[PDB]
Swiss-Prot record, chain A:
Residues 1-71 are annotated as: Necessary and sufficient for interaction with PCP4. This is Calmodulin-1. Ca(2+) 3 binds at D16, D18, N20, Y22, E27. The modification Phosphoserine is found at S4, S24. It is found in: Cytoplasm, Cytoskeleton, Spindle; Cytoplasm, Cytoskeleton, Spindle pole; Cytoplasm, Cytoskeleton, Microtubule organizing center, Centrosome; Cell projection, Cilium, Flagellum. Ca(2+) 4 binds at D52, D54, D56, Q58, E63. Ubiquitination results in a strongly decreased activity. Phosphorylation results in a decreased activity. The modification N6-acetyllysine is found at K17. The gene is CALM1. The lineage of its organism: Eukaryota, Metazoa, Chordata, Craniata, Vertebrata. The modification N6-methyllysine is found at K38. Calmodulin acts as part of a calcium signal transduction pathway by mediating the control of a large number of enzymes, ion channels, aquaporins and other proteins through calcium-binding. Calcium-binding is required for the activation of calmodulin. Among the enzymes to be stimulated by the calmodulin-calcium complex are a number of protein kinases, such as myosin light-chain kinases and calmodulin-dependent protein kinase type II (CaMK2), and phosphatases. Homotetramer. Interacts with MYO1C, MYO5A and RRAD. Interacts with MYO10. Interacts with CEP97, CCP110, TTN/titin and SRY. Interacts with USP6; the interaction is calcium dependent. Interacts with CDK5RAP2. Interacts with SCN5A. Interacts with RYR1. Interacts with FCHO1. Interacts with MIP in a 1:2 stoichiometry; the interaction with the cytoplasmic domains from two MIP subunits promotes MIP water channel closure. Interacts with ORAI1; this may play a role in the regulation of ORAI1-mediated calcium transport. Interacts with IQCF1. Interacts with SYT7. The modification Phosphothreonine is found at T33.
UniProtKB/Swiss-Prot annotation, chain B:
The keyword Magnesium does not apply. The gene is EEF2K. Gene3D superfamilies: MHCK/EF2 kinase, Phosphorylase Kinase, domain 1, Tetratricopeptide repeat domain. InterPro entries: a-kinase_dom, Alpha-type_PK, eEF-2K, eEF2K_a_kinase_dom, Kinase-like_dom_sf, TPR-like_helical_dom_sf. GO terms for molecular function: ATP binding; calcium ion binding; calmodulin binding; elongation factor-2 kinase activity; protein kinase activity; translation factor activity, RNA binding. It holds the Pfam family Alpha_kinase. Its EC number is 2.7.11.20. Threonine kinase that regulates protein synthesis by controlling the rate of peptide chain elongation. Upon activation by a variety of upstream kinases including AMPK or TRPM7, phosphorylates the elongation factor EEF2 at a single site, renders it unable to bind ribosomes and thus inactive. In turn, the rate of protein synthesis is reduced. Residues 40-250 form the Alpha-type protein kinase domain. Belongs to the protein kinase superfamily. Alpha-type protein kinase family. The modification Phosphothreonine is found at T272, T277. GO terms for cellular component: cytoplasm; cytosol; dendritic spine; glutamatergic synapse; postsynaptic density. It comes from Homo sapiens. This is Eukaryotic elongation factor 2 kinase. GO terms for biological process: cellular response to anoxia; cellular response to brain-derived neurotrophic factor stimulus; cellular response to calcium ion; cellular response to cAMP; cellular response to insulin stimulus; myosin II filament disassembly; negative regulation of apoptotic process; positive regulation of dendritic spine morphogenesis.
Length: 71, 497
């Protein structure tokens, strides 16, 4: 439970490319393209939208945890 | 509550776990650890947060630009609880090669964070490709001699591309639309108060941007003010992203319009396609002269110097005159006059005076070497511009209108010599600040004789000759004052017969 939380924080830093605390659509596109994952731009924007509960266009750490620690 | 992409996130997390460190062969973990204080900034709240960080920085730079040199760095995260140096992230630490003031670093951080806010605002309009400006912070190495400051940012992997500069450069090779549309969007959405240019980075992850502001007082020495805006709009060819967000095109001359339209075929072959979810462009302003004169009229408070777009056009005029848009070639005078006309219609007093002098076939300062063709329409236009400038507070134009109503010099053919109006303008000039006694004596002469609507007034003629004599004094013109006193006595002598 403790190292899972640390793992989730590590996973958040993978996508929060600039480390401001928010995963943007551009950052997710950059990270997906760099890692060789094959997702279209529409799929990336939809990932951000799905995890964006507040509606700011970005994914904060709280929403990232909500998405990772899910049913 | 439902998440249908969790496995995409997790597959990416696993791919990263087995991804090699691009800087492994530089052995930064073997560098003696140094201690630093990190200042990070929030631009919405305008607030600074500081913390203590541990860094391992390369001893020699990997690249240098014009102003700064860059060092590879590893830094331990304070978001993680117990990160080891084997997993520390990669960072670029930039330092000014020439020593600068300590506030320059914080001002650059504010610049970058404001550009990031503008990128987010652009993203909120659902563009085909979203943008993001990398956060930049400061690290202070208080144990090094001098306690040096470094800018710190995350290292972006990929092809670093400069899409545009802060001085009209545009990357036409494999042209992209998002950077230029973003810059134009920042110009319009800010109400012409700023423009975010110098777009560069990896894909749409931008860093080292530049902001041109209306006042030009903030954001360092790269802020060329309205001139910088002009440099953008001299080269910007609006693309389909500009049009999908309702951005009005900048009014360019035919020569410039063709020079920027020459790449419309490449603009049509761009890969960035619109979806239709793009919304239309804190109070935004359009970039067209017609909509701007409509807005300025909607102000109703009849004004001058109330449009930044006019100042941009004036900057274009001065750039044309200075040789900024021509090569080792005669500079384009027709387009300079085009932008001067636009600046004048937008309430730039300098432009109005310039065009009044040019259409009146008179000597002028701005575009001095340009002489316009002489027509009757041009004479009427010159007098109208001079009268508008006179009512707007220009003393030279007030004296010229006074002389036009007095002698007829430079008077429009549709008007008539009116000595009461000439007296009005002479006095408006005298109450503002060629010498005073000359104009006072001219008024005195006009009232001594009368004519052109003005009735002979010996009393006021003598009073004004007395004022001119007192003004010849305070200028070391004794004999002139004596002659003016004599002329005052002459004017008064007519009232006793
Ligand atoms: N985060 C980054 N990731 C990768 N490369 C970077 C990064 N930041 C800067 N660079 C590289 O470092 C080079 C020089 O740094 P940069 O231009 O940002 O600063 P500068 O010297 O202030 O620039 P300028 O000369 O335009 O004033 C850049 O042209 C780019 O190639
Ligand atoms: N400007 C800022 N002001 C306050 N907190 C910030 C700021 N930028 C980022 N953070 C917070 O710091 C966390 C990242 O810290 P850390 O990993 O130490 O930074 P970096 O990734 O830049 O090395 C983010 O997830 C966010 O909570
Ligand atoms: Ca981010
Ligand atoms: Ca969010
Ligand atoms: Zn445009």
């Amino acid at each position: 439970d403790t190292d899972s939380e640390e793992e989730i924080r590590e996973a958040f830093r993978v996508f929060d490319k600039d480390g401001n605390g928010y995963i943007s659509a551009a950052e997710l596109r950059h990270v997906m393209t760099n890692l060789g994952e094959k997702l279209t731009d529409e799929e990336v924007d939809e990932m951000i939208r799905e995890a964006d509960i507040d509606g700011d266009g970005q994914v904060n750490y709280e929403e990232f945890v909500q998405m990772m620690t899910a049913k | 509550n439902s998440f249908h992409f969790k496995e995409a996130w997790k597959h990416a997390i696993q791919k990263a776990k087995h991804m090699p460190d691009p800087w492994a062969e530089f052995h930064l973990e073997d560098i003696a650890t140094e201690r630093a204080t990190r200042h990070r900034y929030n631009a919405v709240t305008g607030e600074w947060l500081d913390d203590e960080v541990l860094i391992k920085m390369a001893s020699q730079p990997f690249g240098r630009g014009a102003m700064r040199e860059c060092f590879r760095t590893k830094k331990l995260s304070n978001f993680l609880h117990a990160q080891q140096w084997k997993g520390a992230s990669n960072y670029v630490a930039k330092r000014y090669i020439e020593p600068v003031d300590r506030d320059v670093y914080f001002e650059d951080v504010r610049l970058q964070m404001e550009a990031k806010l503008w990128g987010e605002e652009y993203n909120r309009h659902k563009p085909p490709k979203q943008v993001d400006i990398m956060q930049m912070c400061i690290i202070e190495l208080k144990d090094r001699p001098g306690k040096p400051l470094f800018h710190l940012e995350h290292y972006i992997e990929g092809k670093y591309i400069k899409y545009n500069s802060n001085s009209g450069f545009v990357r036409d090779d494999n042209i992209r639309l998002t950077p230029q549309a973003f810059s134009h969007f920042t110009f319009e959405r800010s109400g012409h108060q700023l423009i975010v240019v110098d777009i560069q980075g990896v894909g749409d992850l931008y860093t080292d941007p530049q902001i041109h502001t209306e006042t030009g007082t903030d954001f360092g020495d790269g802020n060329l003010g309205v001139r910088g805006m002009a440099l953008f709009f001299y080269s910007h060819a609006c693309n389909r992203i500009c049009e999908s967000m309702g951005l009005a095109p900048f009014d360019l001359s035919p020569r410039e319009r063709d020079a920027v339209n020459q790449n419309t075929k490449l603009l049509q072959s761009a890969k960035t396609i619109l979806r239709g979810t793009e919304e239309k462009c804190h109070l935004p302003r359009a970039s067209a002269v017609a909509l701007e004169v409509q807005r300025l009229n909607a102000l109703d408070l009849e004004k001058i110097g109330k449009s930044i777009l006019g100042k941009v056009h004036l900057a274009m005029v001065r750039y044309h005159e200075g040789g900024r848009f021509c090569e080792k070639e005669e500079w384009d005078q027709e387009s300079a006059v085009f932008h001067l006309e636009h600046a004048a219609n937008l309430g730039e007093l300098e432009a109005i005076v310039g065009l009044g002098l040019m259409y009146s076939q008179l000597p002028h300062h701005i575009l001095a070497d340009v002489s316009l063709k002489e027509t009757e329409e041009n004479k009427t236009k010159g007098f109208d511009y001079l009268l508008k400038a006179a009512e707007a507070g220009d003393r030279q134009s007030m004296i010229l209108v006074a002389r036009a109503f007095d002698s007829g010099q430079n008077l429009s053919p549709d008007r008539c010599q009116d000595w009461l109006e000439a007296l009005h303008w002479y006095n408006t000039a005298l109450e503002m600040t060629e010498p005073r006694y000359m104009m006072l004596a001219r008024e005195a002469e006009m009232l001594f004789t009368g004519g052109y609507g003005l009735e002979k007034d010996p009393q006021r003629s003598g009073d004004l000759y007395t004022q001119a004599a007192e003004a010849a004094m305070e200028a070391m013109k004794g004999r002139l004052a004596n002659q003016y006193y004599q002329k005052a006595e002459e004017a008064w002598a007519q009232m006793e017969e």
